[PDB]
Amino acid sequence: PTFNPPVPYFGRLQGGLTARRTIIIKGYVPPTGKSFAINFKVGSSGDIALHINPRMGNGTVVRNSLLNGSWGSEEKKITHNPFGPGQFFDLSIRCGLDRFKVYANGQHLFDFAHRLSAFQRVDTLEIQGDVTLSYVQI
Numbered sequence: 647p648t649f650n651p652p653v654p655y656f657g658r659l660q661g662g663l664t665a666r667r668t669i670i671i672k673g674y675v676p677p678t679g680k681s682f683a684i685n686f687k688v689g690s691s692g693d694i695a696l697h698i699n700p701r702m703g704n705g706t707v708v709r710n711s712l713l714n715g716s717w718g719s720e721e722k723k724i725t726h727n728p729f730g731p732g733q734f735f736d737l738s739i740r741c742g743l744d745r746f747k748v749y750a751n752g753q754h755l756f757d758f759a760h761r762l763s764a765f766q767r768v769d770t771l772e773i774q775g776d777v778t779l780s781y782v783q784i
């Protein structure tokens with residue numbers, strides 16, 4: 647569903663991830679959550695073009711790709727962490743030609759350069775772990 651979709655969320659991307667296709671994810675970080683993952687995948691149990699993994703313990707926002715069975719180099723730098731315990735957030739993920747552009751609460755969060763060059767093969771949004779979703783638009 648689009649409203650209050652329960653976790654784990656699996657949503658098919660109609661014609662694959664178009665360049666300029668934006669995904670909106672509104673949710674809530676439970677006060678006793680450890681971590682949640684937003685995964686843009688090549689199907690079920692295939693490559694993850696972008697893995698976004700807020701971790702409540704260290705307050706990190708890890709980005710990586712799982713490609714050909716293996717994790718790449720993590721990217722961690724941010725200017726703000728909107729995923730604090732008990733906080734609501736509004737995410738905007740826009741698939742660019744050369745990078746994802748992610749905003750949280752209207753504010754730039756990070757860019758993630760494409761490691762999977764052919765992003766259009768991304769056909770599955772996956773959201774997992776310790777998160778409550780109010781709204782997901784794909």
Ligand SMILES: C[C@@H]1O[C@@H](O[C@H]2[C@H](O[C@H]3[C@H](O)[C@@H](O)[C@H](O)O[C@@H]3CO)O[C@H](CO)[C@H](O)[C@@H]2O)[C@@H](O)[C@H](O)[C@@H]1O
Nearest residue numbers: 681683697698699708709710711712717718719720721
């Ligand atoms: C030990 C391992 O940790 C998790 O899995 C994820 C992985 O953890 C990294 C960790 O962030 C890093 O400090 C260390 O050097 O390597 C670990 C293994 O790759 O990070 C990726 C993204 O890079 C994903 O978040 C993985 O889920 C964890 O849940 C495993 O069960 C395991 O305990």
